[PDB]
Design a protein around this ligand. Structure first.
Ligand code: NAG
Ligand code: NAG
Ligand code: NAG
Ligand code: NAG
Ligand code: NAG
Ligand code: NAG
Ligand code: NAG
Ligand code: NAG
Ligand code: NAG
Ligand code: NAG
Ligand code: NAG
Ligand code: NAG
Lengths: 220, 339, 211
C-alpha cells in the first residue's frame, strides 16, 4: 500500500543544481520521517540526511550539508531534495526511504522508493572510438576497446553474430570525463589466428554510428 | 500488586461558569470541579518503572486540547484537507487554565517524586494520587511556557533507544521571564528577556548537556529550516499568533551580553495549524496594547546527528510536536489498574 | 562515524543449504541493526530489524541474531530468488551501511586465464593509452589485480569491470583497465598485471614491453 514514487533523475550537467522529488502515498504522511540515501557505483549506501514532514525540519550529513536542501509540500505529500554544484562523484542511484520512529527516537528504514538514477556529465551525444585488443604473439584472447561514447547503451557483436561462444562483453563504466567505455572479448583457438577473420561490430543508436573493427595480431 | 493499564481519564478544573474565555467555557462542559483536598499516599519501599515516552496520558491530553481548539478558535478561512471553509471570525478571549487529569474507580495514578528523575527507568520514591496537578495546555515551540519546574537539577529528557533522537526536552529548575509586546505596522512586536538571568541559566543547561553527551563542547546553532512555527518561537497570546526570532537568545559568544535581550517578533494571520491539518487565517490583531508575560520553564532542542563528532555536539531549538509539550508535564505520572 | 564491515563480499552457496552472513560494527550499536535484500532491478526491502525481529511479510527461512558488535543474518533454505545482494544498516548513531554481500552459485574452483593487452597504435595517436588485463572464466569471485609499471605499484588509475556469474558454467570474467596519458605511457617499458586468486598456487604475472 505505501509508495514513494520518485522523479527528477537523468543526465545532470557538471556543476549544475539538481532537484529530486518523491510523491508519498498509502500512509499517514505526518507520522514518518523521510531519508535521502544514495549509492554510487561500486559503493555502499550513504545517508545524505532526512526531513520531518510534519514541520519540515531537516538534518544533513556534515560533508554535504552546504550543497543540500530538504523541503516538502505538505498539501501535496511531496518531498524534494536539491543537490547544488554537482560533481562527477555525485553520480549515483538516489532513494527516498521511509523511516520508522517512536515517540522520541528514529530507527530503521521500512520502505524504499522507486529510485532516481543520476548521471553527472556535461557531454553531448558522441559516438564511440573502437580500438583493437590484439591477440598476444593453446587458447588465445582478443577483443575490442569501445572508448568515449555518450549516452548508453552500446551494442557489440562478433563476425555479425556468427561468433558467440566464449564472448564476454563487460558492463560500461562512466569515466571521470563524462564518457562511457567498455571492452568486449572472445577466446578463440590459437590455431585459428592465421586463417580466421575476427571483426567486432559496435552499434551506437543515439548517434547512429556503426563501427566494424578488424582485430588482427600485431607485427612489423 | 498492581499492573500497568490504560483507561479513559476524566478532567477537573477550577473553571468559572460566568467567564467568556474559551478554556473556561470548554472546561465548564467537559470537566468537573477540582477535588477539595487531594490525598497523596506514599508507597513505602516501592520501586516502580516509568516511561514518559510511552504514556497514554499524553495521547489523551492531546485529544482534549485538539477538542478545545476545534471548538473555540474561529479562523476566517480554514484550508484543511483539499477544500476551504469560510465562516465568521470574531476575536475571542484566550488564556489557558490548569487542567487536572483523574482516574476512575479501579485505577490510580502513580507519581514519581525522585527530584532528578529523567523520565524513563526506576523510581525509588513513589506515591499514589487521584488527580494530576494542574497542567496548563500551552501550545508553543522552541520554549516551554508557564509549565512546572524541575525541583533540584536541570533535567535532560530523551527517549534514548538510539542516539538518533527526535526531541530533547530540557526542564529548567529556575524560570526566566519573557515579556512580549505589540504596542498600540500593527503586526510588529518584540519580546524582552533579562539577558543576565537568561545567560546564567543557559550556561547551566550547557553544563548539564556536557554531562549527558560525554564532556563534549556544546554549541547552539539556529534552526536548520522548516516551517516558521519551528524556525521561530511560536506561541499564542490573547488569541493572536506570535512568531519571535530567537537567534539572539542562543548566542554562543555570550555563554560558556548583559542587559535586555529584545527579540523581534511578528503577529501573523496566516498560520500552519499545530494539529497538523493544513493552514488557517485569522483576522488582523485587536487594537491597543497586546502584552503577555510568561515564564520560560523548559527548552525543546534537536541535536545534529550527521556532523563530524569527537569534540563538539550541536543543538538547535526545536519543537513542533505538541505531544512533547504535554510529555514535559506528564513525565512523572502513570496509570495503574488496582485489582 | 560507525563502520559496518560485512563479510564476505561474495558467498558461495547451493540451493537448499543454510547460509550465514556477518556484519561487524566498529563499536557498540546496541541492537539497532537491520538487514535488507536488494534484488537486481528493484529497490531494497527490509528483512530483519532490531538484530532479530523478522519484518512483516518476510518468509520464515530468514532470521537474524547478535552478539556484542557482531550481527548475523541466516537464510536456512536457499531458494533460487535468494542468490542476490544483502546489506546491513545500523541506526544507533546516524545511519550507516555495510558494503553488501552477494550470494552466488557454488562450483568447483577454476583459476583465471590471464591475458594482457597493450594500447593499439590508433589510440596511442589520440593521446591516451589504455592497458587492459583480462581474467577469464574463474571461480570464486574474489580476485586481486595489481598494476605495476617498471615494478612500481599503480594506484588510483585503474577500473575493474566484472560480468555476472555465467548462467551455463557459473564462472566470472573480469577486466582491469589502466589508463595513462600518452606521455606517461611512453616513459616506461614494462607493463604488468599481477593476479591473486585462490585457484592459483602463486600469483600470476602477465607482462609486456613497449615495442
Ligand atoms: C525493601 O525491599 C527490598 C526488596 O527490593 C528488601 O530487600 C528490603 O529488605 C526492604 N526493606 C524494608 C525496610 O522493608
Ligand atoms: C519523596 O517523595 C515525597 C513525596 O511523596 C517527598 O515529600 C520527598 O521530598 C521525596 N524525597 C525523599 C528523600 O523522601
Ligand atoms: C535515564 O536514567 C535511566 C537510569 O534509571 C537510564 O537507563 C536512561 O538511559 C536515562 N535516560 C537518559 C539519560 O536519557
Ligand atoms: C512564574 O514563576 C513564578 C516564580 O518562579 C511563579 O510564582 C509563578 O507561579 C509562575 N507562573 C506560572 C504561570 O507558572
Ligand atoms: C539547577 O540545577 C543545576 C544543576 O544542573 C544547579 O547547578 C543549579 O544551582 C540549580 N539551580 C537552582 C536554582 O536550584
Ligand atoms: C542511553 O541508553 C543506553 C542503553 O543501552 C545507556 O547505556 C546509556 O547510558 C544511555 N545514555 C547515553 C548518553 O547513551
Ligand atoms: C513588559 O514590557 C512592557 C513594555 O516594555 C512594560 O510596560 C511592562 O511593564 C513589562 N512587564 C514586565 C512584567 O516586565
Ligand atoms: C568531565 O570533565 C570534568 C572536567 O572538565 C571532570 O571533572 C568530569 O569528571 C568529567 N566527566 C566525565 C563523565 O567524563
Ligand atoms: C533571525 O534573525 C537573524 C538576524 O538577526 C536572521 O539572519 C535570521 O534569518 C532570522 N530568522 C528567521 C527565521 O527569519
Ligand atoms: C552575541 O551578542 C553580541 C552582543 O552582546 C552581538 O554583537 C553578537 O552579534 C551576538 N552574536 C554572536 C554570534 O556573537
Ligand atoms: C536582571 O536580573 C538581574 C539579576 O538577576 C537584576 O540585578 C537586574 O536588575 C535585572 N534587570 C536588568 C539587568 O535590566
Ligand atoms: C502565561 O501566564 C500568564 C499569566 O500567568 C499569561 O498572561 C500568559 O499569556 C501565559 N502565556 C501563554 C503563552 O499562554
Amino acid at each position: 500500500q505505501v509508495r514513494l514514487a520518485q522523479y527528477g533523475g537523468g543526465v545532470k550537467r557538471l556543476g549544475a543544481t539538481m532537484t529530486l522529488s518523491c510523491v508519498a502515498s498509502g500512509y499517514t504522511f505526518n507520522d514518518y520521517y523521510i531519508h535521502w540515501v544514495r549509492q554510487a557505483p561500486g559503493q555502499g549506501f550513504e545517508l545524505l540526511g532526512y526531513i520531518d514532514p510534519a514541520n519540515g525540519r531537516p538534518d544533513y550529513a556534515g560533508a554535504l550539508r552546504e550543497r543540500l536542501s530538504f523541503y516538502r509540500d505538505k498539501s501535496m505529500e511531496t518531498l524534494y531534495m536539491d543537490l547544488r554544484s554537482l560533481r562527477y562523484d555525485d553520480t549515483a542511484m538516489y532513494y527516498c526511504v521511509r523511516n520508522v520512529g517512536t515517540a522520541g527516537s528514529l530507527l530503521h528504514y521500512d520502505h524504499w522508493g522507486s529510485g532516481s538514477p543520476v548521471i553527472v556529465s556535461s557531454a553531448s551525444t558522441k559516438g564511440p572510438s573502437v580500438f583493437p585488443l590484439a591477440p598476444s604473439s593453446g587458447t588465445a584472447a582478443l577483443g575490442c576497446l569501445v572508448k568515449d561514447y555518450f549516452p548508453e547503451p552500446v551494442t557489440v557483436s562478433w563476425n555479425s553474430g556468427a561468433l558467440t561462444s566464449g564472448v564476454h562483453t563487460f558492463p560500461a563504466v562512466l569515466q571521470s570525463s563524462g564518457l562511457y567505455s567498455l571492452s568486449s572479448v572472445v577466446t578463440v583457438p590459437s590455431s585459428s589466428l592465421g586463417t580466421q577473420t575476427y571483426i567486432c561490430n559496435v552499434n551506437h543508436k543515439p548517434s547512429n554510428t556503426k563501427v566494424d573493427k578488424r582485430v588482427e595480431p600485431k607485427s612489423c | 500488586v498492581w499492573k500497568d493499564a490504560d483507561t479513559t481519564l476524566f478532567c477537573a478544573s477550577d473553571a468559572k461558569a460566568h467567564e467568556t474565555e474559551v478554556h473556561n467555557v470548554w472546561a465548564t462542559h467537559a470537566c468537573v470541579p477540582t477535588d477539595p483536598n487531594p490525598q497523596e499516599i506514599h508507597l513505602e519501599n516501592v520501586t516502580e518503572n516509568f516511561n514518559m515516552w510511552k504514556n497514554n496520558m499524553v495521547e489523551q491530553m492531546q485529544e482534549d486540547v485538539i477538542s478545545l481548539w476545534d471548538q473555540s478558535l474561529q479562523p476566517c478561512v480554514k484550508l484543511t484537507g483539499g477544500s476551504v471553509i469560510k465562516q465568521a471570525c470574531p476575536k475571542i478571549s484566550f488564556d489557558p487554565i490548569p487542567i487536572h487529569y483523574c482516574t476512575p474507580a479501579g485505577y490510580v495514578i502513580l507519581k514519581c517524586n525522585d527530584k532528578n528523575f529523567n523520565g524513563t527507568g526506576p523510581c525509588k520514591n513513589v506515591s499514589s494520587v487521584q488527580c494530576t496537578h494542574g497542567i496548563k495546555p500551552v501550545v508553543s515551540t522552541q520554549l516551554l511556557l508557564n509549565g512546572s519546574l524541575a525541583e533540584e537539577e536541570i533535567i535532560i529528557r530523551s527517549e534514548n533507544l538510539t542516539n538518533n533522537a527526535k526531541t530533547i526536552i530540557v526542564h529548567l529548575n529556575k524560570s526566566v521571564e519573557i515579556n512580549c509586546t505589540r504596542p498600540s505596522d500593527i503586526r510588529k512586536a518584540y519580546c524582552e528577556i533579562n539577558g543576565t538571568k537568561w545567560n546564567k541559566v543557559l550556561k547551566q543547561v550547557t553544563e548539564k548537556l556536557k554531562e549527558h553527551f560525554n564532556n563534549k563542547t556544546i554549541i547552539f546553532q539556529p534552526p536548520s529550516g522548516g516551517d516558521l512555527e519551528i524556525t521561530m518561537h511560536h506561541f499564542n497570546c490573547r488569541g493572536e499568533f506570535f512568531y519571535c526570532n530567537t537567534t539572539q537568545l542562543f548566542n554562543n559568544t555570550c555563554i560558556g551580553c548583559n542587559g535586555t535581550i529584545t527579540l523581534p517578533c511578528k503577529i501573523k494571520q496566516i498560520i500552519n495549524m499545530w494539529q497538523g491539518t493544513g493552514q488557517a487565517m485569522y483576522a488582523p490583531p485587536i487594537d491597543g496594547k497586546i502584552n503577555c508575560v510568561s515564564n520560560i520553564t523548559g527548552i525543546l532542542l534537536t541535536r545534529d546527528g550527521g556532523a563530524n563528532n569527537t569534540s563538539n555536539e550541536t543543538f538547535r531549538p526545536g519543537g513542533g510536536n505538541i505531544k512533547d509539550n504535554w510529555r514535559s508535564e506528564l513525565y512523572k505520572y502513570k496509570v495503574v489498574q488496582i485489582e | 562515524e560507525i563502520v559496518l564491515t560485512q563479510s564476505p563480499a561474495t558467498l558461495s552457496a547451493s540451493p537448499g543449504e543454510r547460509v550465514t552472513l556477518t556484519c561487524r560494527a566498529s563499536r557498540s550499536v546496541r541492537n539497532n541493526v537491520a538487514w535488507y535484500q536488494h534484488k537486481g532491478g528493484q529497490s531494497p526491502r527490509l528483512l530483519i530489524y532490531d538484530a532479530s525481529t523478522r519484518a512483516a511479510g518476510v518468509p520464515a527461512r530468514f532470521s537474524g541474531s547478535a552478539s556484542g558488535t557482531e550481527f548475523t543474518l541466516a537464510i536456512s533454505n536457499l531458494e533460487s530468488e535468494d542468490f542476490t545482494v544483502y546489506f546491513c544498516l545500523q541506526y544507533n548513531n546516524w545511519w550507516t551501511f555495510g558494503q553488501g554481500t552477494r550470494v552466488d552459485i557454488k562450483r568447483t574452483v577454476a583459476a583465471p586465464s590471464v591475458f594482457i593487452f597493450p594500447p593499439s597504435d590508433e589510440q596511442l595517436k589520440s593521446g591516451t593509452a589504455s592497458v587492459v588485463c583480462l581474467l577469464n572464466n574463474f571461480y570464486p569471485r574474489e580476485a586481486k589485480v595489481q598494476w605495476k609499471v617498471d615494478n612500481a605499484l599503480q594506484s588510483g588509475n585503474s577500473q575493474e569491470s566484472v560480468t555476472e556469474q555465467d548462467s551455463k558454467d557459473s564462472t566470472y570474467s573480469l577486466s582491469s583497465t589502466l589508463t595513462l596519458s600518452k606521455a606517461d605511457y611512453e616513459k616506461h617499458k614494462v607493463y604488468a598485471c599481477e593476479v591473486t586468486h585462490q585457484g592459483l598456487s602463486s600469483p600470476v604475472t602477465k607482462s609486456f614491453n613497449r615495442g
